[PDB]
Amino acid sequence: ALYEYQPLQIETYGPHVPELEMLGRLGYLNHVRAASPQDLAGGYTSSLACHRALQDAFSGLFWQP
Amino acid sequence: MYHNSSQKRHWTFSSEEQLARLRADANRKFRCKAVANGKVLPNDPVFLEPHEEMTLCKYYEKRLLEFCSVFKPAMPRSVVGTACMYFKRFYLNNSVMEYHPRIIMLTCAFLACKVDEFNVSSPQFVGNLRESPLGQEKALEQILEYELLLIQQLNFHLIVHNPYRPFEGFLIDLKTRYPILENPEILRKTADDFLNRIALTDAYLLYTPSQIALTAILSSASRAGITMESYLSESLMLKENRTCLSQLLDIMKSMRNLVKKYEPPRSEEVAVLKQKLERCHSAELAL
Amino acid sequence: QVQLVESGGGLVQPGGSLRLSCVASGFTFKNFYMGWVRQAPDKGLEWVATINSGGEIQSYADSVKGRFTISRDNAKNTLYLQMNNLRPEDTAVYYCSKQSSTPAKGQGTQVTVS
Amino acid sequence: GHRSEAKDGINRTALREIKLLQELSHPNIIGLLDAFGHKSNISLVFDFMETDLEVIIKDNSLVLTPSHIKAYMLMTLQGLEYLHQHWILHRDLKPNNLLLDENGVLKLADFGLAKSFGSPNRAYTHQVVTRWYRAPELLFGARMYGVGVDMWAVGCILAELLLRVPFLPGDSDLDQLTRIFETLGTPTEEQWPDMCSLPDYVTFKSFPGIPLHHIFSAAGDDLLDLIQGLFLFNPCARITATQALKMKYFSNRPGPTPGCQLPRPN
Numbered sequence: 001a002l003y004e005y006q007p008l009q010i011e012t013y014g015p016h017v018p019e020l021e022m023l024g025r026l027g028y029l030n031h032v033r034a035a036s037p038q039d040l041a042g043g044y045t046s047s048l049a050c051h052r053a054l055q056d057a058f059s060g061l062f063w064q065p
Numbered sequence: 066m067y068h069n070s071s072q073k074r075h076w077t078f079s080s081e082e083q084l085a086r087l088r089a090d091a092n093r094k095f096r097c098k099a100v101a102n103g104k105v106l107p108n109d110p111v112f113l114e115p116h117e118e119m120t121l122c123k124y125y126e127k128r129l130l131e132f133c134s135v136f137k138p139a140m141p142r143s144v145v146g147t148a149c150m151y152f153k154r155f156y157l158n159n160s161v162m163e164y165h166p167r168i169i170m171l172t173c174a175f176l177a178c179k180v181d182e183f184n185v186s187s188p189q190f191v192g193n194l195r196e197s198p199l200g201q202e203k204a205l206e207q208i209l210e211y212e213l214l215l216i217q218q219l220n221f222h223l224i225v226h227n228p229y230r231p232f233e234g235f236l237i238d239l240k241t242r243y244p245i246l247e248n249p250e251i252l253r254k255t256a257d258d259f260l261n262r263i264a265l266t267d268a269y270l271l272y273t274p275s276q277i278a279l280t281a282i283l284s285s286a287s288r289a290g291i292t293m294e295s296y297l298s299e300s301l302m303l304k305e306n307r308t309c310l311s312q313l314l315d316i317m318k319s320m321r322n323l324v325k326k327y328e329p330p331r332s333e334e335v336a337v338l339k340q341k342l343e344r345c346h347s348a349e350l351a352l
Numbered sequence: 353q354v355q356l357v358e359s360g361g362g363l364v365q366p367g368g369s370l371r372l373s374c375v376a377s378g379f380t381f382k383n384f385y386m387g388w389v390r391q392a393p394d395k396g397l398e399w400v401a402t403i404n405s406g407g408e409i410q411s412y413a414d415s416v417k418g419r420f421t422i423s424r425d426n427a428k429n430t431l432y433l434q435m436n437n438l439r440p441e442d443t444a445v446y447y448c449s450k451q452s453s454t455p456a457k458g459q460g461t462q463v464t465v466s
Numbered sequence: 467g468h469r470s471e472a473k474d475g476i477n478r479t480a481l482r483e484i485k486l487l488q489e490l491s492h493p494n495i496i497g498l499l500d501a502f503g504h505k506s507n508i509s510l511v512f513d514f515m516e517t518d519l520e521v522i523i524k525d526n527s528l529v530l531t532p533s534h535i536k537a538y539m540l541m542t543l544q545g546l547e548y549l550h551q552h553w554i555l556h557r558d559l560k561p562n563n564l565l566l567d568e569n570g571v572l573k574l575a576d577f578g579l580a581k582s583f584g585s586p587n588r589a590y591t592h593q594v595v596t597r598w599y600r601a602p603e604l605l606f607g608a609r610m611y612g613v614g615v616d617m618w619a620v621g622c623i624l625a626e627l628l629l630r631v632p633f634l635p636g637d638s639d640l641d642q643l644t645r646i647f648e649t650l651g652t653p654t655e656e657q658w659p660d661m662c663s664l665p666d667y668v669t670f671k672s673f674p675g676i677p678l679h680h681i682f683s684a685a686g687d688d689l690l691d692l693i694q695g696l697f698l699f700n701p702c703a704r705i706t707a708t709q710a711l712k713m714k715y716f717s718n719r720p721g722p723t724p725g726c727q728l729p730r731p732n
Contacts, residue, residue: 002721003540005712008548012068014275015301024417025437031240033586035414037396037660042608043615043701044586047414050237052553052584056226057234059067060273061301062309064316065079066552071488141587179478180485182581182588186468187475209475213503216476216484221501223485230585383687385694387703389656397659402703405691409709411702447656451703452694453675455654 013063017055023047028054067274071222076154078270087157089115095160099350111345117338118161123330124339125166126152126265129174136193138185140178146227148177150269155218157270162345164211171204172211180223228260231278239282243296246286256285259324266323272316280317354378356448356458363464364438372461374431374448379456382426387451388433390444390463398444401433402451415441438465467591475506479578483510486554486577494545496565496573512575516568517731519623520561523630525731532689534729535627536715537722538564539692541572542620547707549574550613553584557594559619561626570725583612592666595619597642598632602653603701605643607666614701617710621696628682643670651675653699661699688715 023029024047032050039045067073078084092115100107113121129152133145151173156166171194178185191201191208216223239249246252260281263269268277286293297303303310360372372388387402401412401422410422421434431448443465450456469478487498500511519538522528542564549556556563556574563576579594592607594600594615601618603611625633634649636642647653652672653661661667678690685693692715695705705713716722 002719003536003716005717008551010066010069010551012066014068021412021418024412024414025419026241028237028241029414029417031237036663038663038665039610040702041606041658041660041663042603042610043612043704044610045414045612045702047417048584048612049586053230053234053237055066055234055553057231057238057275057278059231059275060073061275061279062306062313063068063073063273064312065077065271066489069489069491175475179476179481184468184478186470187473189468205473209473209506212475212506213508216503221484222488223481224489383690385698389659397655399659399700399703402698402700404695404705404713406688406714408714409695409705409712411705411709413702449656451657451700452698453651453677455651455656457656 012055012059014058014061017051017058020047020051023050023054067226070224070226071220072224072226073273075220075222076270077273081267081271084157084267084270085115088118091156091158091160092118092162095162095350099162102350102352104348104350111341111348111350113160113162113338113341113345117341118156120330120334121161121166121338121342122152122156123265123328124335125170127330129170130264132171132193133174138183138189141181141183142229143227144174144177144181144183146229146264146269147181147225148174149264150225150227151177151215151219153267153270155215159218161342163351164214165342165346168204168207168211169215172208172215175208176212176215176223177225180225226274228274228278228281231275232256232260232281235279235282238300239296242300243293245295246291246293251289252282252285252291254285255288256281259284262324262327263320265329266327268320268323271323272320276313276316277320279313280320283317284321354450354454354456356450356456358446358448358458358461361446361461361463363466366438366440366465368438368465370435370438370463372433372435372446372448372463374458376429376431376448379450381424381429384453385451386424386431387449388422388431388446389449389457390442390446391460392444395444400446403431435463438463440465467589476503476508480508480510482580483577484508486580490548490552490554492545492548493571494541494573495548496575496577513567513573515565515573515575517566518562518575519564519566519572521731522566522729523561523626525729527732528729530627530630530729531723532720533723535624536720537570537725537728538572538627539620539624540711540716540722541725542574542623543707543711545572545574546616546620547711549580550616550707553582554580555583555613556580556616556619558596559616559623560596560599561623564623566728570723570728597639598622598635600642601701602643602646602699603664605639605646605666606661606664606668608664608701611701613706614704617696617704617706620707620710621693624693624696625682628685640668643668647671647675648673649676649681650697650699658699688713688718691715 028050029046032046035046096112099105133140191205194201236249355377357375364370388400390400391397403410403422403424407424419437423432445460445462447460448458497513558579565573565575589609592604599619599622601615622633634645636645647670692713698704
């Protein structure tokens with residue numbers, strides 16, 4: 001059997017987090033602090049902060065014990 | 066992540082009554098243990114009532130909030146919410162009569178500084194206690210004695226999800242997709258106060274951090290007289306799943322009612338209960 | 353001799369589109385990660401996009417994420433940069449770059465968004 | 467940055483393993499079976515594993531086929547993709563920390579240096595990842611970074627899979643940097659623009675490097691493509707675990723050896 005990539009499917013119980021490319025063209029990144037060149041030099045970008053905040057905000061929004 | 070977290074799986078409960086039963090259960094077990102040791106009678110008035118343990122926990126929780134706000138190395142907010150979460154979880158199944166809330170609230174903050182990776186040394190931590198260097202060392206010894214006990218009573222579930230990052234996530238989404246609200250930053254002040262209010266209730270044990278954060282924002286918008294039901298139906302696309310829109314609206318109403326019926330601990334009542342609690346420990350009912 | 357020849361620049365209005373080309377010669381274009389970099393006046397170099405040798409994966413800077421699309425034709429030894437919804441802050445000289453091993457950069461093509 | 471020992475109570479490294487592994491469940495990540503303590507001492511119990519990847523690499527009698535190497539890399543990247551999707555960096559990837567059970571299931575193991583990432587308000591230790599596998603941005607003192615600190619180590623593990631020997635065995639932090647640059651070439655500003663802004667950045671002589679196909683004579687174009695993406699100097703352009711799994715190397719014909727058929731060391 002050969003391999004083919006399957007994305008990991010985990011229920012978040014919340015709204016859809018925008019895809020990484022939507023963060024740029026829809027302007028999500030305009031509302032997070034811009035990464036300084038010293039940050040970009042190590043690999044840290046503003047899309048990391050924006051993406052995690054978006055995921056934590058939507059995670060479990062619709063989950064009721 | 067929260068949606069598969071131990072916090073959601075084991076430390077998010079369905080009702081206030083379930084919380085009250087667990088706390089009353091811890092109170093009753095200590096009474097049985099104390100009476101079994103043959104020092105006290107089944108209804109000696111030295112025992113605290115479940116509602117009296119709660120009043121003392123509200124008090125020492127505010128003292129824990131006050132301790133963190135003056136912590137010399139500026140303490141990140143996520144350390145404080147983690148410490149308060151530990152404090153709530155510990156006395157869900159333990160009695161203030163057996164483990165003193167003064168020592169436990171410091172152990173919660175001490176453990177939270179390690180879990181959240183807020184690296185302060187032990188002398189830096191107890192140095193924030195306004196006591197003599199003789200007493201600051203005594204407090205450190207007691208913290209290290211209750212440290213393992215706290216982790217055991219948490220079932221070794223240490224990661225706590227706070228509503229602070231979810232709060233920022235909604236603001237990003239508000240600023241990006243909801244132009245109806247011109248400048249979403251006006252709500253931060255009042256939503257932050259509303260967020261601090263629910264932190265004193267049992268909402269951390271009853272709702273997801275995302276729902277808590279959205280409640281604080283929408284409540285602040287209600288205070289500012291701003292309609293944003295379209296943010297839920299249109300922007301969050303809850304027009305499609307009406308049952309999920311209904312549940313979420315009920316959760317936010319339930320949370321706002323939790324804050325409406327919050328009773329702050331009265332200073333005179335605390336003085337009496339601290340006196341009774343101190344007598345309970347000095348008699349050493351454990352053995 | 354190695355050589356990268358950019359083309360396709362010009363004046364575009366805000367919201368417009370442009371595709372840049374880069375013809376590679378002097379080296380085995382198919383065997384190297386290629387990319388685009390840009391430099392605006394009074395501003396340092398800014399990485400834009402990179403594509404692998406096979407072409408099936410791409411990485412983009414935050415400033416161009418969702419608007420630009422990098423691609424390559426290994427048979428024609430050309431590198432492409434599709435630019436959509438161009439903003440005034442995208443104005444810079446754009447350079448084709450060999451993103452791995454021995455460095456290489458072309459002369460650059462000017463993209464101006466008014 | 468602060469701490470100490472002996473009067474701080476329970477070991478912070480053990481708390482890292484507890485707090486993180488208590489929230490994770492994946493076939494390619496070690497499972498925490500038990501935890502217990504006594505007077506600020508702590509003990510952890512994990513899944514029973516048979517061997518790790520380092521003894522497999524060091525076994526001269528063991529022959530590593532292309533299908534074997536593809537299977538090890540597939541399981542490593544699958545567990546790492548799960549890790550990064552939960553916003554956790556491992557920060558100590560090496561063959562020592564890749565364990566295999568009796569069924570050929572590879573699991574990421576030592577989480578004593580693992581830490582969550584993505585938050586702009588947190589500073590990160592740059593003295594992480596075992597030196598031989600440490601990314602150049604960490605050697606340059608980066609206090610804010612991302613998944614590249616794991617992907618660079620994955621490249622060094624794959625290189626140790628192919629060479630059966632440590633790829634970049636530096637004696638010190640500066641010697642590790644010389645070996646990185648004299649082997650892979652020194653990056654120019656077009657390949658790492660803001661590189662000079664790093665706190666511990668040091669300027670090196672411009673080395674041309676060795677071509678990848680000379681370093682790895684036994685690797686095809688698809689495998690060379692994967693290696694090249696893991697060792698990109700730009701930490702923002704360096705491929706992610708998800709991007710690595712989507713490359714043609716893993717879906718190409720040789721295919722991965724099943725777990726039950728992976729070699730068992732002597």
